[PDB]
Design a protein around this ligand. Structure first.
Ligand SMILES: [Mg+2]
Ligand SMILES: [Mg+2]
Ligand SMILES: [Mg+2]
Ligand SMILES: [Mg+2]
Ligand SMILES: [Mg+2]
Ligand SMILES: [Mg+2]
Ligand SMILES: [Mg+2]
Ligand SMILES: [Mg+2]
Ligand SMILES: [Mg+2]
Ligand SMILES: [Mg+2]
Ligand SMILES: [Mg+2]
Ligand SMILES: [Mg+2]
Ligand SMILES: [Mg+2]
Ligand SMILES: [Mg+2]
Ligand SMILES: [Mg+2]
Ligand SMILES: [Mg+2]
Ligand SMILES: [Mg+2]
Ligand SMILES: [Mg+2]
Ligand SMILES: [Mg+2]
Ligand SMILES: [Mg+2]
Ligand SMILES: [Mg+2]
Ligand SMILES: [Mg+2]
Ligand SMILES: [Mg+2]
Ligand SMILES: [Mg+2]
Ligand SMILES: [Mg+2]
Lengths: 261, 178, 145
RNA sequence: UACCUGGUUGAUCCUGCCAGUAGUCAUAUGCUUGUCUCAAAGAUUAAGCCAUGCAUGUGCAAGUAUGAACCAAUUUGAACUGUGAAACUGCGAAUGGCUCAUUAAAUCAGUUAUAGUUUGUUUGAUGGUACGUGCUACUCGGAUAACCGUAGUAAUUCUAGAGCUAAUACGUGCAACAAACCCCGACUUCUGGGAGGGGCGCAUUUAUUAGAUAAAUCCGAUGAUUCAUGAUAACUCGACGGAUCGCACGGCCUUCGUGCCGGCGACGCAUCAUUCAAAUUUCUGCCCUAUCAACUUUCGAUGGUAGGAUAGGGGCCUACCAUGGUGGUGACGGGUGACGGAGAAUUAGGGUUCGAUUCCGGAGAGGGAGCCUGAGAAACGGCUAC
RNA sequence: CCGGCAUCGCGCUCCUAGCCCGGCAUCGUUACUUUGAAGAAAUUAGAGUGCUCAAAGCAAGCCAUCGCUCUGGAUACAUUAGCAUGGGAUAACAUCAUAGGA
RNA sequence: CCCGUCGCUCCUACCGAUUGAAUGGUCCGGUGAAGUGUUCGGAUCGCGGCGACGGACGUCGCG
RNA sequence: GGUGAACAGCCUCUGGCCAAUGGAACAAUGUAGGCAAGGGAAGUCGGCAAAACGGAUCCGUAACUUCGGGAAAAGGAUUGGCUCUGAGGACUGACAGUCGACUC
């Protein structure tokens, strides 16, 4: 082409949106934003698809034009704003809060929470480096750039981030022994504990992560995101506690729910 | 117009290459600015990719030259081109390009060396202890000119910048200019 | 000197030969010391590269090139160009229908630093860099004769 | 459903083909045709040619409204008020739609790289100095649409001249410290100094310098950087560093003076990061053909050095130098009724054949070529030439 | 089926490092196999779901088929090339006799 | 049972004077539109200095 | 001697000549030598005669062949003057010095 592309045809959309292949020719094209448009969920989907506060593309438009919806602390009018991992979606009119985290099946969930968990998010740092006049600052994987961090926060670490004062209020030093949620691949969502990290000079490094109930799996360092120091999380895990399972097991669970029903 | 594609080339085997595409603007070239050494100073802007700007120096007369052993940089005027390691015909036409060899005024650098009683002397005797001043760079001063090497891209930035030759690199061109 | 064999005097960028204050004890590329670099990935800079006098802008250990991308091994096939060789890669290609293999090959031009020395049919490991000429994208890092 | 039957003989057993027997998301054609659901459709020959119509414009409370209207209508001090058409300004029209002509490691696929680049927009951070002899900001320019009116031409979003009037259009012009360090340097005393007062935002180009170890006070990053980044010396005829616009009022006088304040926002400029992307780029992989065995190299073919150009690497191009590069593992050349893939038909398995077409990548707009604008085009529902 | 080991199992300082100790990295290269990563969707296979059935679709089902409850939107194959992990039977290329060996 | 020349009829391909004919492509050479950049050029147009002259000029300011 | 590949042609020096009956004029027809618009062999038994081509450097060259040729096939491009640049040498004590007529 001779420039950018502004359309997203439905069959080409990320599979984890669960859009239906006959519901129309196009999909919502994720606007440029803090998340990488293949690991995001736009606002249109959250309202009309999941929450069903709307029935059409135009109805979700109106809702934002009343400004009921706030994302990550700030009011967003954009229809296709790219919400992502560990954002907060809050509707003060209804008085509800959500974190965005993954199913074990690797799909975003709106995890309902109180106000006290809305005050903060978690972010992993992309890099820490000097800048104008040697003033230290850090990149996150959320687009954010925080200047003047602890000299302890190195690359790949994770930070607590108050949305009111906006600076680092805590940080986890990414290393072996903490709990992590995976944000890509076939293992995305699966939480567990770093058991080993083997590096390879000139390539990606592999993380070894084990479910609380024994099952062992591996990803590459890109798709890893520490939640808490040690076994305990610093956020509320979703409806399933990050433990992925065989197809037989959920078959057993239904009939086990179908013997009581 | 001018293009930087590889399509018109022969494959490494030596075989022909067919043209499956037309020429693209993101692939263009522009014709040089073959910068002159002349007092009718002129630099002209270019609108390039991204809405950025470049400077074509067409005629240049003065430059910014560094004396590294002394860590002193002063503007001087460009006198003439004396050696060009690509093509003799750039010397004859007096064209300024990166790595050309040029003689410059030496007037600002003589006076800085002239500089550098009670308060002032008790530094000028601190200095004058480490003076070395190779006879090669001394003799050029007696001639009133300094051999220098351009180290900027005049057709790219619109400036003639460079450094006074010293040591081996001064010695090497001097044997050439003989 | 022997390096200086051209219509321009050859020098490394940002190494200042005529320095007022000098010290061999400082980092390479300072105080007049020859610049030399660690390529990474587990290769060792040869001594002739470190205490060399040649100038080569394309050398991995002293030039301006960065090794990144892929790392291939192969056999030197021809060493008749100025500071460039053709290395033959030998490999087997699976023919699915007949469940057998055939010997295919590829010829890859790679730049050779003056620090090494290659004869016809020597084991070389090359590393990928930016394009260095029309066909050269690789740089010789080891030579096992 | 991993299957066969008729035909050579006077008869026999073979070889071997012909013929039958099933399907095709595979086309046409013929005869026939009641209902429900579903949906391909000028690709094949002519990337041949087109009458007509449509397919790209756009306005907010938040750039500019006495230019002429509409509705309030004025107590005739101020309003063009509230809504506005036209028009100047800004942004978009580089996406989508269509097709498959050229194109045979080419496009393309999986997989790499950018430390070799640009990137309007989003999101986050960031922003002093303009001159004042840095001893704290230094003043406000005409002229152009809509409109009025004179016209030419057969001519059409062909076109000229005069009269007005706006700016977030255009052009100017006020600028925030200790100056933090650095160089001069009257004199002072002798200096290891105190020094009176003259020279320093951010960008740009060049140069010098810093950015630290190894066991008997060294302190950011990478697998790897003269890296990030700092200091210094200058250099530029500097793109820049707000003369912009909304509602809401509501604390309190200093002259009680739209009075000192001070809020939330709309737009805008600049650096870094991010995002939406591209551009190149590594490895491997493609049909038939040898009645196609040599091809490339003067005039770029393969490499070297210095440049030039580019957004940037590179013979991309230039000057000089060397003689290389590919080939029975099929180079080079020819054919293709050849865009590539995801896929499709058939299928015991192994296969054979198809893939113009709705997803992804590419390419083109009658054939070639060259461009302007713009962040982005070698754009064709843009221009210029043939 | 297998760890974990002693026989007459060339080292470890440097990371994992047990209450003197397993389970250490470079001083030959590969194919082959094992497991994983990361792999566009649509199509293929395949789970759930009474569109009245079916081709389909990705829905829907219970509640008092009453101010809502409960949700789902699985999973697999992917030849070759590339990346990582163990095995080291088989089969390649290279190479101890100037001892320039440990 | 069966072979081949020859006579007759039809079908397909071959050689063939004719510097045969047509069409499309390519190598080189000659001419070369238009654009792009460069060099002079300077119609006229902006403080409309000054002379401090009487809307008029030239010395003009550079752009 | 110069030009040039050249004992070609053309001009010059040494040496030798101006010996070919003179004067006037400038008709036809001759003889010897030129040039001619447009056309281009129609002239003629017939391109007879004339014209066109022509040196050198670079490129390119078919049929046919006794494989040696054809071939200078055919078909193209260049060529003055001036000012420079590079290469190619000798001797003498990877250098230094001096010298050097010629070609591209
Ligand atoms: Mg969008
Ligand atoms: Mg069969
Ligand atoms: Mg028989
Ligand atoms: Mg019978
Ligand atoms: Mg049949
Ligand atoms: Mg398109
Ligand atoms: Mg911003
Ligand atoms: Mg080169
Ligand atoms: Mg270069
Ligand atoms: Mg085709
Ligand atoms: Mg077709
Ligand atoms: Mg047409
Ligand atoms: Mg196009
Ligand atoms: Mg076009
Ligand atoms: Mg059209
Ligand atoms: Mg392998
Ligand atoms: Mg001669
Ligand atoms: Mg003669
Ligand atoms: Mg005539
Ligand atoms: Mg005749
Ligand atoms: Mg005749
Ligand atoms: Mg006649
Ligand atoms: Mg006759
Ligand atoms: Mg004749
Ligand atoms: Mg002949």
């Amino acid at each position: 082409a001779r420039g950018l592309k502004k359309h997203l045809k439905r069959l080409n959309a990320p599979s984890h949106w669960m859009l239906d292949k006959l519901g129309g020719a196009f999909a919502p094209k994720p606007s440029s934003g803090p998340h990488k448009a293949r690991e995001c969920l736009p606002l249109i989907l959250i309202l009309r698809n999941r929450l069903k506060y709307a029935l059409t593309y135009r109805e979700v438009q109106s809702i934002l034009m009343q400004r009921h919806i706030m994302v990550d602390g700030k009011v967003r009018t954009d229809k296709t704003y790219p919400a992502g991992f560990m954002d907060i979606i809050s509707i003060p009119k209804t008085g509800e809060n959500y974190r965005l985290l993954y199913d074990t099946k690797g799909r975003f969930r709106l995890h309902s929470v109180r106000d006290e968990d809305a005050k903060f998010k978690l972010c992993k740092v992309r890099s820490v480096q000097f800048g104008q006049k040697g003033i230290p600052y850090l990149n996150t994987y959320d687009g954010r750039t925080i200047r003047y961090p602890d000299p302890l926060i190195k690359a790949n670490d994770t930070i607590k981030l108050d949305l009111e004062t906006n600076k680092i209020v805590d940080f986890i030093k990414f290393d072996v022994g903490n709990v992590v949620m995976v944000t890509g691949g076939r293992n995305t969502g699966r939480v567990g504990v770093i058991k080993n990290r083997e590096k390879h000079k000139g390539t990606f490094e592999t993380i070894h992560v084990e479910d609380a109930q024994g099952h062992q799996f591996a990803t590459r360092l890109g798709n890893v995101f520490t939640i808490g120091k040690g076994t305990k999380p610093w956020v509320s895990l979703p409806k399933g506690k990050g433990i992925k399972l065989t197809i037989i097991e959920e078959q057993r669970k239904r009939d086990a729910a179908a013997q009581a029903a | 117009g001018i293009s930087r594609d590889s399509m018109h080339k022969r494959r490494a085997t030596g075989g022909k290459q067919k043209a499956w595409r037309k020429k693209r603007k993101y692939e263009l070239g522009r014709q040089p600015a073959n910068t002159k050494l002349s007092s009718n100073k002129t630099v002209r802007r270019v609108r390039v990719r991204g809405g950025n700007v470049k400077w074509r120096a067409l005629r240049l007369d003065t430059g910014n030259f560094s004396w590294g052993s002394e860590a002193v940089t002063r503007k001087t005027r460009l006198l003439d081109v004396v050696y060009n390691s690509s093509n003799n015909e750039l010397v004859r036409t007096q064209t300024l390009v990166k790595n050309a060899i040029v003689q410059v005024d030496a007037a600002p650098f003589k006076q800085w060396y002239l500089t550098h009683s009670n308060n002032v002397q008790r530094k000028l005797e601190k200095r004058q202890q480490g003076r070395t001043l190779d006879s090669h760079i001394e003799e050029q001063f007696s001639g009133g000119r300094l051999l220098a090497c351009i180290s900027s891209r005049p057709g790219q930035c619109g400036r003639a910048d460079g450094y006074i030759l010293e040591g081996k690199e001064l010695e090497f061109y001097m044997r050439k200019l003989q | 000197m022997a390096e200086q064999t051209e219509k321009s005097f050859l020098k490394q960028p940002k190494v200042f030969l005529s320095t007022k204050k000098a010290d061999k004890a400082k980092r390479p590329g300072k105080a007049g010391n020859r610049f030399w670099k660690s390529v990474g990935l587990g290769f060792k800079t040869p001594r002739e590269a470190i205490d060399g006098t040649y100038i080569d802008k394309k050398c991995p250990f002293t030039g301006t090139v960065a090794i990144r991308g892929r790392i291939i091994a192969g056999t030197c096939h021809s060493a008749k160009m100025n500071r460039t060789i053709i290395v033959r890669r030998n490999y087997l290609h699976f023919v699915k229908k007949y469940q057998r293999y055939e010997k295919r090959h590829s010829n890859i031009p790679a730049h050779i630093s003056p620090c090494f020395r290659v004869k016809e049919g020597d084991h070389v490991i090359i590393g990928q860099c930016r394009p260095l000429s029309k066909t050269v994208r690789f740089n010789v890092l080891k030579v096992v004769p």
